[PDB]
Amino acid sequence: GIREKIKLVSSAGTGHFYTTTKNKRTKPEKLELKKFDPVVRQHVIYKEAK
């Protein structure tokens, strides 16, 4: 059970987040994926968070 849950808070300001897992001891980098933001209805850049 190494993997740890994280969430990707949107940069578009609208409070929104996808949640996922990440192997934190082999992936020091922080994810930055482009995904849908239904509040603003546009594809924005999602950055990691708590």
Binding site: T19, T20, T21
Partner: protein
């Protein structure tokens, strides 16, 4: 005396227009990162109590 209603069931079922009962789909409280989005969005709307369970609910709600 008047029949006391089961207060726990009165918070979970609501009688519809033709005598049925609507409830809220389970498995949508926590542990929500595992489940596929198709699974979650299908437990969001209301539901209808099955024919087998129908006998046990009308007993629990005599006044509704």
């Amino acid at each position: 005396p008047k029949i006391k209603t089961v207060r726990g069931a009165a918070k979970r079922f609501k009688k519809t227009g033709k005598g049925g009962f609507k409830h809220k789909h389970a498995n949508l409280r926590h542990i929500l990162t595992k489940k596929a989005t198709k699974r979650k969005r299908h437990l969001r709307p209301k539901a209808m109590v099955s024919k087998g369970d129908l006998g046990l609910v009308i007993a629990c709600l005599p006044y509704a």
